Design a protein around this ligand. Structure first.
Ligand SMILES: [Mg+2]
Ligand SMILES: [Mg+2]
Ligand SMILES: [Mg+2]
Ligand SMILES: [Zn+2]
Lengths: 121, 238, 181, 148, 50, 134, 65, 73
RNA sequence: UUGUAAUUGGAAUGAGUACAAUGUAAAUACCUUAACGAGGAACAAUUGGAGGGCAAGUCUGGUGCCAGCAGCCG
């Protein structure tokens, strides 16, 4: 019913943000709504993360429209300041994207989180 | 491969309403009901005929589970020009618009979909194509939309649901004609991921037999897709 | 004289080694898991057969039998600990549903491959046998080492390994010395 | 149009990588005697033979043969109706069980065939990757199932 | 050495008499381990001819 | 009534009958009386020593014929003369008259093959890994 | 650096001594000879070197302790 | 001093020529398995990552009169 | 896109050699470890079975040019 949906819980958000920090270290993270849009256009995004406290929320609702069209999992986190923190950027992030790479060193947990996100959807 | 300015030779396929475009590579194509546009960005082939410029659309096996089926060589396809078809799981016009091409102006396509957001584009596509009747409704309760549909010659189910067998039987029980067509797309991962694919397909075939659908044919869809088989059957009421 | 030290055979020859389907099966198992020879497959099969025969015998006993409860619970705990049996499947019936592949994946070679430390199962074998892999703080050189759930997260390059932060191996420093000279 | 049936995806040369525990096994009519005659219980002679949970399956055709047998083989009939034995519906007119069994294994490579008929066994043997179960001596025997 | 075996082959062809191998200069070895291995290799080779 | 006593106290007649009848088996009779080795080709041994009497096929025109590989050997244990196979004519060169040959079980009628000559393996000679001591 | 940890310490006034198991962490070193272990233990327990005995030292597979 | 040579020392005698793969069974089985997989790609269509980029058509061509599906009797 | 390399690049490593230490009643060995120790990695894995092909070559038989045997020998 709410526009931000599904919204990850306190437990689930941690593992998602865990993958986010690991991805940032390995240059496998795309930060910001504009970048996430580009990845969805290219079909190189494993899944998309959004912040449910975006002010206003609407300016990132185009990712959900893109996502299930391309059959890409997505999920919302309560906080953007927290999301920006894990991203490694000194500013809040309302949306980010995990780039697809089957040769990545952190593949396994990416699929683990992705499986849960699919279940939540 | 198939670049923009390449010239190709178009020839009919064994199944009526399906055509083959030849060249260094071969493309299996369908005539465009609404020429001059692509529905999901597919390549289009234009031919000058006395002179009218008829158009054709490429038909990607990696996008439509049906298409990979014909690539694999299904013996019988009830989908034919001038036939009524009931499409379940019409997420969008990616595959429905092509089924509309095969049936032609005389036939129609009853496109059934549940989730609202994909349905919107299905309505938008239905505007260009007179012969589709999209029905934004949950297939699990065919009582709701019995108003909109008469008999249908063939029922196609692309629904990815664990109880997909029940939906087919209920829909087939209502609108499918005696000796009608049944074509099902099965994904074992959605039905039962615990067991192997082959066990699942046997189970699905079994449920169809319980529902008075005589299975006629099944085909695995590799290399285009994993763990997928299209089962073709006939509805034997008596 | 001193008391005997017991010994046992860890593998048994099959009932019919010459079945073509079987031969293809060991071809699969060796190829996918990079096993040196058939004896490894026979060993794993023998261990699995012992386990499942014990499980069957335990099942034959009536439910609530103290022997049944105790020994079945112990077997399930061990199988869960080694990781063949998933947490949600703690019943003796699913033990009978185990397969050789489950044990094979838990081998340190396969785990090293999956974790990304090696680009091939054979690369994993050569890395292990060359003393580059350490579980926790200890170095393991045995591809047949079975990894536990807790141990799985601690697999890493050994501190002494050149890949693990030690000095370069002999070849590297030899090449550097000749280049400097 | 020419037909070249596609060999099943469950098969790598001669090993079926799909048949796995718990096994699904089709019961042939003659199997019941040599089970009863040898005092071998159906469910568990299978478990002892295969060391797994086995799901016996009786089709309509094999069932249809059984009542046709008559009073002499009532015990076989009753064991066939043991609720642990699930039933498979058939949608082909013929009641000849041997043909029905051969078709089902041709269709999907997930069944073990439990029979002692030499003619049927040879036909199944020609089909690759079909484990063939039989009863001899004192208990059941499985030939083409190396996971054993 | 060659001279040893040339004699052995000559003895083999013209009728083997009793042959006793006697190994010398073993004190020249520096390590016990290598001494034993040489003894093992020498004995096994010698076992082949006689 | 199957022709055998069946009372709960009748094992003795069963036992005695079983012991008396068990002698009917040829296998049992041979095992107990120790006569199972009469049928053995070597009279109970796995290998037999022999003396090479004559190489019968040495004059044969066809090379590597079955006849060429037959050698007449005198079994030293009893003096009975027998025939044996050699693996090949190349091996036949090593075998010459009046040498020790160790025979093992194998032109029908010839049931022995030479495995050692003069205390050395024929295979070892044929692979050229040893020299026959004379 | 090298560290010496004493465990399972027992005080045996019957034999007038203290028994224990010595674990020696010696990263980047082959091992510690009994002499250095003796002088370090003597310093730690404040006794004369001649009063310290050490034996039965085995380095685990892989080295380091 | 006249030292013995290699033929003398090892005394391998006359042996057939043997391929290097036999020296390590692991390499031999690896090669056997990969050869098997290549043969399977000929025996059957096997999935190979799916679609990679724009769809360029079938490279091997369509046979209108050939059906590969398995029939119910 | 399959097969074959006395082709080619720099990384890893123990059999072995060996300071030292540990080990031991004293020693050897094991676990450690300075330093050496790899392209034919000649640092030279074996045991059996099956099937070829080659000549101005050899033997045997005959409804011509063939067949059998076999072929370290031309
Ligand atoms: Mg090291
Ligand atoms: Mg040694
Ligand atoms: Mg009577
Ligand atoms: Zn039937």
């Amino acid at each position: 019913n709410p526009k931000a949906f599904p919204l990850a819980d306190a437990a689930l958000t941690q593992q998602i943000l865990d993958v986010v920090q690991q991805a940032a270290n390995l240059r496998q993270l795309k930060k910001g709504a504009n970048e996430a849009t580009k990845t969805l256009n290219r079909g190189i995004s494993e899944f998309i993360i959004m912040a449910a406290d975006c002010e206003p929320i609407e300016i990132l609702l185009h990712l959900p429209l893109l996502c299930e069209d391309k059959n890409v999992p997505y999920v919302f986190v309560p906080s953007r300041v927290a999301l920006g923190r894990a991203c490694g950027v000194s500013r809040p992030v309302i949306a980010a994207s995990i780039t697809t790479n089957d040769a990545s060193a952190i593949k396994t947990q990416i699929y683990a989180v992705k499986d849960k996100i699919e279940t939540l959807l | 491969g198939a670049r923009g300015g390449a010239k190709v030779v178009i020839e009919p396929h064994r199944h009526a309403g399906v055509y083959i475009a030849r060249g260094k590579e071969d493309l299996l194509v369908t005539k465009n009901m609404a020429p001059g546009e692509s529905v999901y960005g597919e390549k289009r082939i234009s031919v000058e005929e006395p002179p009218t410029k008829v158009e054709y659309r490429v038909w990607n096996p990696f996008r439509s589970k049906l298409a990979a089926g014909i690539m694999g060589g299904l013996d019988e396809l009830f989908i034919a020009p001038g036939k009524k078809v009931l499409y379940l799981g019409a997420a969008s016009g990616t595959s429905v618009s092509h089924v509309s091409d095969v049936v032609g102006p005389e036939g129609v396509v009853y496109a059934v979909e549940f989730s609202h957001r994909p349905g919107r584009e299905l309505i938008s596509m239905a505007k260009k194509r007179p012969n589709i009747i999209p029905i934004i409704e949950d297939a699990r309760h065919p009582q709701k939309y019995r108003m909109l549909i008469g008999m249908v010659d063939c029922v196609f189910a692309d629904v990815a649901q664990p109880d997909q067998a029940r939906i087919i039987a209920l829909n087939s029980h209502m609108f499918l004609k005696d000796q009608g067509g049944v074509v099902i797309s099965i994904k074992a991962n959605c039905i039962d991921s615990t067991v192997d694919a082959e066990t699942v397909f046997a189970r699905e075939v079994q449920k169809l037999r319980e529902e008075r659908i005589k299975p006629l044919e099944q085909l695995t869809l590799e290399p285009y897709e994993r763990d997928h088989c299209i089962v073709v059957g006939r509805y034997m009421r008596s | 004289p001193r008391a005997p030290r017991t010994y046992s055979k860890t593998y048994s020859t099959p009932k019919r080694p010459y079945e073509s389907s079987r031969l293809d099966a060991e071809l699969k198992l060796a190829g996918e898991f990079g096993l040196k020879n058939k004896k490894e497959i026979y060993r794993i099969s023998f261990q699995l057969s012992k386990i499942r025969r014990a499980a069957r015998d335990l099942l034959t006993r009536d439910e609530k039998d103290p022997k049944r409860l105790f020994e079945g619970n112990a077997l399930i705990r061990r199988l869960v600990r080694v990781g063949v049996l998933s947490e949600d499947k703690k019943k003796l019936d699913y033990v009978l549903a185990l397969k050789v592949e489950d044990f094979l994946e838990r081998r340190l070679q396969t785990q090293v491959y999956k974790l990304g430390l090696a680009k091939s199962v054979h690369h994993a074998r050569v890395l292990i046998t060359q003393r580059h892999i350490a579980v926790g703080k200890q170095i393991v050189n045995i591809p047949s080492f079975m990894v536990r759930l807790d141990s799985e997260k601690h697999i890493d390059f050994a501190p002494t390994s050149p890949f693990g932060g030690a000095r370069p191996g002999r070849v590297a420093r030899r090449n550097a010395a000749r280049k400097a000279e | 149009t020419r037909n070249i049936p596609q060999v099943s995806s469950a098969l790598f040369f001669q090993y079926n990588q799909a048949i796995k525990p718990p096994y699904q096994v089709l019961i042939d009519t003659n199997f019941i005697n040599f089970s009863i005659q040898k005092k071998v219980d159906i469910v568990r002679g299978m478990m002892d033979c295969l060391l797994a949970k086995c799901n016996p399956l009786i089709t309509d055709c094999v069932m249809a043969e059984l009542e046709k047998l008559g009073p002499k083989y009532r015990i076989a009939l009753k064991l066939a109706r043991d609720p642990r034995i699930k039933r498979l519906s058939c949608s082909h007119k013929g009641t000849y069980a041997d043909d029905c069994l051969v078709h089902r294994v041709l269709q999907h490579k997930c069944y073990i065939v439990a029979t002692n008929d030499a003619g049927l066994k040879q036909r199944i043997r020609k089909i690759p990757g079909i484990p063939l179960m039989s009863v001899g001596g004192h208990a059941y025997v499985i030939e083409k199932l190396p996971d054993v | 050495e060659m001279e040893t075996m040339e004699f052995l082959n000559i003895a083999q062809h013209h009728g083997m008499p009793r042959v006793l191998g006697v190994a010398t200069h073993l004190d020249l070895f520096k390590s016990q381990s290598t001494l034993r291995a040489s003894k093992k290799r020498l004995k096994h080779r010698f076992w082949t001819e006689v | 009534g199957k022709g055998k006593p069946r009372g709960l106290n009748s094992a003795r007649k069963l036992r005695v009958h079983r012991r008396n009848n068990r002698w009917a088996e040829n296998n049992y009779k041979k095992r107990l009386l120790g006569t199972a080795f009469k049928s053995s080709p070597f009279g109970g041994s796995s290998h037999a020593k022999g003396i090479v009497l004559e190489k019968l096929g040495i004059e044969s025109k066809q090379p590597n014929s079955a006849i060429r590989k037959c050698v007449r050997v005198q079994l030293i244990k009893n003096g009975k003369k027998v025939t044996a196979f050699v693996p090949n004519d190349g091996c036949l060169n090593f075998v010459d008259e009046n040498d020790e040959v160790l025979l093992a079980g194998f032109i029908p009628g010839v049931r022995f093959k030479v495995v050692k000559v003069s205390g050395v393996s024929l295979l070892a000679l044929w692979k050229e890994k040893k020299e026959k001591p004379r | 650096a090298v560290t010496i940890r004493t465990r399972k310490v027992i005080s045996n006034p019957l034999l007038a001594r203290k028994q224990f198991v010595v674990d020696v962490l010696h990263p980047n070193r082959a091992n510690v000879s009994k002499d250095e272990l003796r002088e370090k233990l003597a310093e730690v327990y404040k006794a004369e070197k001649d009063a310290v005995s050490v034996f039965g030292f085995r380095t685990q597979f892989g080295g380091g302790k | 001093k006249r030292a013995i040579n290699y033929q003398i020392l090892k005394n391998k005698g006359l042996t057939p020529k043997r391929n290097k793969d036999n020296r390590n069974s692991r390499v031999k089985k690896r090669k056997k398995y990969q050869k098997a997989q290549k043969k399977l790609k000929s025996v059957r269509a096997v999935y190979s990552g799916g679609q990679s980029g724009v769809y360029e058509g079938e490279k091997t061509g369509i046979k209108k009169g050939l059906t590969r599906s398995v029939k119910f009797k």
